[PDB]
Amino acid sequence: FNDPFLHELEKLRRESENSKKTFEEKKSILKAELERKMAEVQAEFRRKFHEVEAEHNTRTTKIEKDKNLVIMNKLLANAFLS
Amino acid sequence: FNDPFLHELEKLRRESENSKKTFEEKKSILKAELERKMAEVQAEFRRKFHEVEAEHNTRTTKIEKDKNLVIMNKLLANAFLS
């Protein structure tokens, strides 16, 4: 640059494009970290939850086998009479 | 319960009622801590964000005041006639 004024002015217009830039990018990084932490906190939830739900379905098919062993040994030892 | 068959049956209604109880309550807890983890991941993203936004607005007024300071200086050294 010839004019040390037009110079300083560009040195600063440039200086504020770096500003606008590193800001725009940080802004993106965070947005993209939050996105990932949230998808991973919700996949940790979905995990434990499908285990809790499994534990129960097995809990109740047990309770289930048995309820029907009762109803059978009853119905059986009772047609032994009629 | 006089009837022993009726007894086995009640013993089971009672067991299935705790299957449901502890399941629904396990469920209720996992959901409670999802709320809590997500709430705080996202309320510390904002804490981190506003700190870049802040950091930028200060950078930018810094520049703005270098600019202004350099323009007026030109304007003054150049404050005459003919």
Q: A59 with B23: CB under 8 angstroms? A: yes
Q: B33 with A52: CB under 8 angstroms? A: no
Sign, CA dihedral B7-B13-B16-B21, equals negative
**Which of B32, B44, B50 lies closest to A38, judged by CA?**
B44
- In the 8-state DSSP scheme, what is residue B1? -
- The single residue listed with the structure tokens 């640059």 is A1
Per this entry, what is the length of chain B?
82
Sign, CA dihedral B57-B58-B61-B63, equals negative
Resolution, expressed in angstroms to one decimal: 3.2
Domain map (residue ranges) of chain B: 1-82
Q: How was this structure determined?
A: X-ray
Nearest CA-CA distance, residue B31 and chain A, Å: 8
State the Cα–Cα distance between residues B53 and B58, nearest whole angstrom: 9
Q: A interface mutation test: which of B14, B23, B25 has the most A CBs within 10 A?
A: B23
The domain defined by A1-82 folds into 6.10.250
SS3 B63: helix
Alpha helices in chain A, H assignment, sequence order? 4-76
The angle formed by the CA atoms of residues B37, B43 and B44, to the nearest 5 degrees, is 95
